[PDB]
Amino acid sequence: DIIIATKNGKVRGMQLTVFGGTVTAFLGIPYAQPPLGRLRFKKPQSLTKWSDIWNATKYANSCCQNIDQSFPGFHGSEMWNPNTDLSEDCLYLNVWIPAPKPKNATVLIWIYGGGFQTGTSSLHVYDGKFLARVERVIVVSMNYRVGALGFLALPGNPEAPGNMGLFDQQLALQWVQKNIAAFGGNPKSVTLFGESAGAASVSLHLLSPGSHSLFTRAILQSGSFNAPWAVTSLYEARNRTLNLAKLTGCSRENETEIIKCLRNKDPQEILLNEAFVVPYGTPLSVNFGPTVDGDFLTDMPDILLELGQFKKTQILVGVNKDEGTAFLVYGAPGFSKDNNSIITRKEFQEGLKIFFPGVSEFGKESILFHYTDWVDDQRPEQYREALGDVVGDYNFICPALEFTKKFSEWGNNAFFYYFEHRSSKLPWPEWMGVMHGYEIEFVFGLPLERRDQYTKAEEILSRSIVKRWANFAKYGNPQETQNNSTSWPVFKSTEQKYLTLNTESTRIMTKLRAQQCRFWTSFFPKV
Amino acid sequence: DIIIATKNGKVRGMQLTVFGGTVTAFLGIPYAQPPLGRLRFKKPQSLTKWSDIWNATKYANSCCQNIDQSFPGFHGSEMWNPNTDLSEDCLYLNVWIPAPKPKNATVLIWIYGGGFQTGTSSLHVYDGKFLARVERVIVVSMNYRVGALGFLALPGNPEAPGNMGLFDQQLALQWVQKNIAAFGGNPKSVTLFGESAGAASVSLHLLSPGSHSLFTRAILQSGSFNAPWAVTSLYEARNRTLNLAKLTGCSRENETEIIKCLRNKDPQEILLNEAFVVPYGTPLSVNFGPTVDGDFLTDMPDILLELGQFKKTQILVGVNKDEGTAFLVYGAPGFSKDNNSIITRKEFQEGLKIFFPGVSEFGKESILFHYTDWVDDQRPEQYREALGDVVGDYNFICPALEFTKKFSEWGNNAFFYYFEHRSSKLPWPEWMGVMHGYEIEFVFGLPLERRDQYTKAEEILSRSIVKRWANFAKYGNPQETQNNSTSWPVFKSTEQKYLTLNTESTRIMTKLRAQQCRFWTSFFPKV
Ligand SMILES: *[C@@H]1O[C@H](CO[C@H]2O[C@@H](C)[C@@H](O)[C@@H](O)[C@@H]2O)[C@@H](O[C@@H]2O[C@H](CO)[C@@H](O)[C@H](O)[C@H]2NC(C)=O)[C@H](O)[C@H]1NC(C)=O
Ligand SMILES: *[C@@H]1O[C@H](CO[C@H]2O[C@@H](C)[C@@H](O)[C@@H](O)[C@@H]2O)[C@@H](O[C@@H]2O[C@H](CO)[C@@H](O)[C@H](O)[C@H]2NC(C)=O)[C@H](O)[C@H]1NC(C)=O
Ligand SMILES: *[C@H]1O[C@H](CO[C@H]2O[C@@H](C)[C@@H](O)[C@@H](O)[C@@H]2O)[C@@H](O[C@@H]2O[C@H](CO)[C@@H](O)[C@H](O)[C@H]2NC(C)=O)[C@H](O)[C@H]1NC(C)=O
Ligand SMILES: *[C@H]1O[C@H](CO[C@H]2O[C@@H](C)[C@@H](O)[C@@H](O)[C@@H]2O)[C@@H](O[C@@H]2O[C@H](CO)[C@@H](O)[C@H](O)[C@H]2NC(C)=O)[C@H](O)[C@H]1NC(C)=O
Ligand SMILES: C[n+]1ccccc1/C=N/OCc1c(F)c(F)c(F)c(F)c1F
Ligand SMILES: C[n+]1ccccc1/C=N/OCc1c(F)c(F)c(F)c(F)c1F
Ligand SMILES: *[C@@H]1O[C@H](CO)[C@@H](O)[C@H](O)[C@H]1NC(C)=O
Ligand SMILES: *[C@@H]1O[C@H](CO)[C@@H](O)[C@H](O)[C@H]1NC(C)=O
Ligand SMILES: *[C@@H]1O[C@H](CO)[C@@H](O)[C@H](O)[C@H]1NC(C)=O
Ligand SMILES: *[C@@H]1O[C@H](CO)[C@@H](O)[C@H](O)[C@H]1NC(C)=O
Ligand SMILES: *[C@@H]1O[C@H](CO)[C@@H](O)[C@H](O)[C@H]1NC(C)=O
Ligand SMILES: *[C@@H]1O[C@H](CO)[C@@H](O)[C@H](O)[C@H]1NC(C)=O
Ligand SMILES: *[C@@H]1O[C@H](CO)[C@@H](O)[C@H](O)[C@H]1NC(C)=O
Ligand SMILES: *[C@@H]1O[C@H](CO)[C@@H](O)[C@H](O)[C@H]1NC(C)=O
Ligand SMILES: [Ca+2]
Ligand SMILES: [Ca+2]
Ligand SMILES: [Ca+2]
Ligand SMILES: [Ca+2]
Ligand SMILES: [Ca+2]
Ligand SMILES: [Ca+2]
Ligand SMILES: [Ca+2]
Ligand SMILES: [Ca+2]
Ligand SMILES: [Cl-]
Ligand SMILES: [Cl-]
Ligand SMILES: [Cl-]
Ligand SMILES: [Cl-]
Ligand SMILES: [Cl-]
Ligand SMILES: [Cl-]
Ligand SMILES: [Cl-]
Ligand SMILES: [Cl-]
Ligand SMILES: [K+]
Ligand SMILES: [K+]
Ligand code: NA
Ligand code: NA
Ligand code: NA
Ligand code: NA
C-alpha cells in the first residue's frame, strides 16, 4: 500500500502490473486551485493543502474543450478526444514511478499537443507506465487549460493576462521541483517533452525566465514556437477577445467589465463561440494561443531566439515524414480518409486558398511553382502529395529546423530526428503515410507490449527510441550505446546532420528539406 | 482457417479465444445492397451475390445517426455511441458460432435499442462471443437504419413507405433462415431478443405477418410497441416528413418530388435537421419511428394486440427497477450526474412539463397527486425519486406489463422479470439506481469474464441469467434447473406473477406497480 507525503498532503497511489514488474501510478494529483468563478481567466493559484489522504487512483477531469466530430466512431480521430469528463476543474497532474521506488530517478514531463485548443494527459498513447517500467525514469504529465479559457488575452490586464495554460504547465513544473524527491525523483534532472502544441510549449519554456530553473533539458516533437500556428499576435489576440465578447453579449466599455461578463457565462457558451472569433480559419487554426504577455513572455519570441535569450541546455528536436497529411481531410477539397484522394491541379490550388487564406495570388503561385517540379514523373498522386508536403513543411518541419539551427548557434548540443516509420496499426489510409502525432506511441513504448499487434520490428524501434529519449534525459546525449546503433551526431548549423528513425535502414543525413525550407523560411515571408 | 459458403458466396471468419475455448466470429456480413442513391428511403434490396471470399473479420460501418454529446469523455454515455464509421452503407450483420462447429444450435438474434434514432450492433455490451462460448448457442446481430433514413414516412408511397429499419431487421432474419444452417445453426429454433427500441421492434415482429415464420420466440427487455415513445402516428409522420422537407429546402408539390429532393441531400443535412421536426420534444423523443405503413404493419398495433392478431409463441418480458432515471439528466431542471439531484416540488413540476409537454394542468396535477403519497416519510429525495418513477412507469414498465398481460390472454406462456441489481462498475451516480440499459451486460455475460472487476456475486447472477435466456431460447422455458434456483412461474393475467433478478434475495412476486399502472394504463389516457 503506497502513500506519499507531498508538501500539500498525503496522496495514495496504485500498483500496476507492467511487463512482469510493478509501476506505481498516482493519477489525478491536484496542483492548483480549480480556476472557477472569479478565478476563470486568471493565472493558476497555489493549492490550499489538506489533511487526510487524497486518492490519486484515477485520471482526473480534462479541461473544457471542443471535440473533433468529423469522423464519429472512427478510432483514428477518436483516440485524440478526451477520455474523462470535461470540467473547468481540471488542473491535475499524473506521476508514474518505478517499483521498487527509485533512489534518484530522472524525471520526464509530458506536455500534450492539441493546437492549444484541445488535449488531455489521460490519453492511452501518453501512458507513462512503460517508460517508468523499462527505463526506470519517473514520468509526469499535467492537464493545462486550453482555448479561450486558457489563452484569452487582454494583455497587461491581470483579470485575463494571456498565457494562462502556459502558467498552468509552469505551476505543474513547480510542483515537481517541490515534491518529486518524495517520489524518488531528482528535481535537478527534469526533462520536458511534448508534441505539436506541447512541443511549442516546451520551446517557450526555454524562453521564459520563470521556467529557467524548473527543468534541465528539452525534447520537441513536431513543433516549436516559431511555427506559424503557434503564437498569437497582439492585434489578433485583442480582435479575437473582443469578438468572443460580442458573440456572447459581453461587449462592454471598461475591458475589465468584459471579463466579468465573460466570467458569468457557461463554459459551453464560451466554447461554442470560440470557433467564430476568426472570420476565415484554417484546419490548423489556433484561435486562442500564446501571446507576448510581458510576463511568461517578455518579448516577441522570434527576437529572443535570434538574440540568444533562452535557457542554455541541450535539445532533442524532430519531425515526422508526413506531418501535413492529417490536416488535408479537415477541409481541403477532394480529400477523404475513405479514398485515395487523387486530386487535380485545380483542387491543389483550391487547397492552397484553404491553407493560406490571406495570401496573394503571386504568393500562392510561388508555392505552386516550388512544389510542382515533378520528379520527373507524371504520377496521378503528384498534386495530392505536393499539398501534404506544402502543409507539413510550412507548418512543422521548416520551423522545427529553423528553431534548432538558431538554438544551436549559441553553442549548445542539439539533436535532430526524422521519424519515417508508419505504424502497422495506423487506422488512417495508406496515402497519409507517416502522420503527425504517430511517433508518440513509439516514444511512450506502446509497441513494447507484445499483446498488441505491433510487429517485432516495431518493438525493436520503440525499444531503441525509448532508450535514446531516456539517455537524452539522463545524460543529455540520445545514444543507444549497446546494440550497434547508428551514432546520433549533434546538429550544427554548418552541416545540419540529422538521424532518421525507421525500422529498416537507420542513418545520418544532412540538410533536411533544404530547398523547401529556404522557400518557406527566407522567401515566403516577404510575400 | 474457417470459411463458410453462404447462399451469396463464401465468407471468412476469425477465431477468438474465449474462456480457454474458441468461438468463431463472422463480423460484418452484408445482407442487403447498400441503400444509397436511388435506394435511400426504400425498403432494403436483396444482395447481388459474389465470387471470391468476403472477409468478415471486423465490425462494419454503423448506420448514419446523431451522437449524444451531453457528456463528452464520460464512459457512462460514450459506451452507447457508435464505435465504427457512420455510413449509409451499413446493412451488415454479425455471427458468433461455438467451436467446435455446433450440430444444430439454437440461434439468438439481437436487435439493439436507441429510440429508433441511434444504435449499432458493434457495441462492447452486445458482444455475442460469451453466449456462444458458454451456452453453445449461435448469436446473430444486425445493423438497421435509424432516424429519418430508416423511418421517414410518406405512407403508401413506396419511394419512402416507412418502417425501412424494421424491414432491414426482417431481411436480416431472412438471411438467417436462408444461411444459418451452413454455420451449424437451426433455422427452426430462432429467438429474437432486444432492448428498449429493440424490444419494441421484437414486439412488432410478433405482430408482422412477414416476420411470422422468420423466428420461433421472443424476448423483450425494457420495451414494447405500446410504449408511448414507440409508434409514430400518421399525423405525426407526415407533419414530421413535411417539416424535414421545408428545413432542407425540399418542399415540393408532388410528394414523390419531395423524396428525390431529399435523396440528393448529404446524410449530414438530413441528420442535422431531424432534431427540429418536432416543435417541443422530450428526452425520450422518437422523431422518426415505426408507423402503420400497411405493409410491415397492417393496422394500428394496439388493435392487433387487443384482438389477438399476432404470432402465437412464448415470450420473456421484463424491465429494470430504475428505468426512468437516465433520462432525467437529459433535460429535467435541477438534475445532474455529478450531484445527488435533490430537487424541490417546483422542480418536480417543471420536470413534468418537460416529460409531458402537451398535457393539461389537471393531467400533470394527477401525476403529482398519484406520485407524492409519501411513504410515509419526508426524505429530501422524495421528489427526485418520484420523477424517475414517473418517467419509468409511464415509458417502460407499465407498457411492458400491459403488453405481457394482453399477449398471455391468448393462451401462450409468458414470463416476466424485474431486474433490480445495480452494476458495481456503473459509471453513473448512485441515485440513478438500476438504470435503463444496464441489464444488457448481464444478459450477454460480460461479468463471466473474471478479468473485469465485476464481483463474484455478479458472475453468479450473469451465469444464472445467461442460462435462463438460453433455456428460454432452446426450450421456451427460462428455468435454471440445476443450482436450486427459484422456479420462474408463467405470467397469467389473473395473478400476474413475476421473477425478481438480483444478487441477493431472488423471488416470485405479483402485480408489479399495480397502482401506478392502473393510473397510467386506465386513467391517464382519458386526460
Ligand atoms: C474521394 O472522396 C471525396 C470526399 O467526399 C466523398 O467521399 C466519398 C467516400 C463519397 O462518399 C462521396 O459521396 C463523398 O462526397 C470526393 O470529393 C467529393 O466529390 C463530390 C462529388 O462531386 C463532391 O460533391 C464533394 O464536394 C467532394 N468532397 C470534397 C471533400 O471535396 C472525391 O471525389 C473522391 N474521389 C476519389 C474516388 O478519388
Ligand atoms: C446539482 O447540479 C445541477 C446541474 O447543473 C450544475 O451542475 C453542478 C455540478 C455545477 O457545476 C453547476 O454550476 C451546474 O450548473 C444544479 O442545477 C443548476 O443550478 C444552477 C444554479 O442556479 C442553475 O443556473 C442551473 O439552471 C441548474 N441546472 C439545471 C440542470 O437545472 C443543481 O442546483 C445542483 N444541486 C445540488 C447540489 O443538489
Ligand atoms: C476582427 O474584427 C472583425 C470582427 O468581425 C467578426 O465578428 C465575429 C462576430 C465573427 O462572426 C466573424 O465572422 C466576423 O468577421 C473582423 O470582421 C470584419 O470587420 C469589419 C469591420 O472592420 C466588419 O464590418 C465585418 O463584420 C467583418 N468583415 C469581413 C468581410 O470580414 C475582422 O476581419 C477582424 N480584424 C482583424 C483580423 O484584425
Ligand atoms: C407540425 O407542423 C408545424 C411545423 O412547424 C414547425 O416547423 C419546423 C421547421 C420546426 O422548426 C418546428 O420548430 C416548427 O414548429 C408545427 O408548428 C406550428 O405550425 C403553425 C401552423 O400550423 C406555424 O405557424 C408555426 O410554425 C408553428 N407554431 C407553433 C407555435 O408551434 C405544428 O406544431 C406541427 N403540427 C402537428 C404536431 O401536427
Ligand atoms: C492532439 N493531436 C496531436 C497529434 C495528432 C493529432 C492530434 C489530435 N488529432 O485530432 C484529429 C484531428 C486531426 F488529426 C486534424 F488534422 C485536425 F485538423 C483536427 F481538427 C482533428 F481533430
Ligand atoms: C441505446 N441505449 C440503450 C439503453 C440505454 C442507453 C442507450 C443509449 N444511451 O445513450 C445515453 C443517453 C441516455 F442514457 C439518455 F437517457 C438519453 F436521453 C440520451 F439522449 C442519451 F444519449
Ligand atoms: C481511498 O482508497 C481506499 C481504498 O481503495 C479507501 O478505503 C479510502 O477510504 C479511499 N478514500 C476515499 C474513497 O475518499
Ligand atoms: C541526485 O542527484 C543530484 C545531482 O544531479 C545530487 O546533487 C543529489 O544530491 C542526488 N540526490 C540523492 C542522491 O538522493
Ligand atoms: C473599470 O472597472 C473597474 C472595476 O470597477 C475599475 O477598477 C476601474 O475604475 C474602471 N476603469 C475605467 C476606465 O473606468
Ligand atoms: C539490445 O539487444 C537485445 C537483444 O538483441 C534486446 O533484447 C534489447 O532490448 C536491446 N536494447 C535496446 C535498447 O534496443
Ligand atoms: C482476407 O484475409 C486473408 C488473411 O487475413 C487475406 O490473405 C486475404 O487476401 C484477405 N482478402 C482481402 C484482404 O480482401
Ligand atoms: C435440427 O432440429 C430440427 C427440429 O427443431 C430438426 O427438424 C432438424 O432436422 C434438425 N437438423 C439437424 C439435425 O441438422
Ligand atoms: C409525381 O411525379 C411523378 C414522377 O414524375 C409522376 O409519376 C406523377 O405523375 C406525379 N404526380 C402528380 C400528382 O403530378
Ligand atoms: C451451478 O453451480 C456451479 C458451482 O456451484 C457453477 O460453477 C455453475 O456455473 C452454476 N450454474 C449456473 C447456471 O448458475
Ligand atoms: Ca465544459
Ligand atoms: Ca534544474
Ligand atoms: Ca521524404
Ligand atoms: Ca541501427
Ligand atoms: Ca453520415
Ligand atoms: Ca421458425
Ligand atoms: Ca421498487
Ligand atoms: Ca435463487
Ligand atoms: Cl493564430
Ligand atoms: Cl494555372
Ligand atoms: Cl551537404
Ligand atoms: Cl528532402
Ligand atoms: Cl413519437
Ligand atoms: Cl402546488
Ligand atoms: Cl395479489
Ligand atoms: Cl411496486
Ligand atoms: K490538432
Ligand atoms: K436512448
Ligand atoms: Na470521442
Ligand atoms: Na494509434
Ligand atoms: Na463517443
Ligand atoms: Na457498463
PDB file of C-alpha atoms and ligand atoms in Angstrom, chain B residues 64-65 86-88 267-268 271, ligand 19:
ATOM      1  CA  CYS B  64     -25.867   7.244 -40.009  1.00  0.00           C
ATOM      2  CA  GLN B  65     -27.071   8.801 -36.764  1.00  0.00           C
ATOM      3  CA  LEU B  86     -21.055   6.109 -39.682  1.00  0.00           C
ATOM      4  CA  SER B  87     -22.111   5.441 -43.265  1.00  0.00           C
ATOM      5  CA  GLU B  88     -25.306   4.836 -45.199  1.00  0.00           C
ATOM      6  CA  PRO B 267     -26.815  12.438 -44.961  1.00  0.00           C
ATOM      7  CA  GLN B 268     -25.480  15.129 -42.632  1.00  0.00           C
ATOM      8  CA  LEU B 271     -29.267  14.302 -39.753  1.00  0.00           C
TER       9      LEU B 271
HETATM   10 CA    CA C  19     -23.410  10.162 -42.065  1.00  0.00          CA
END
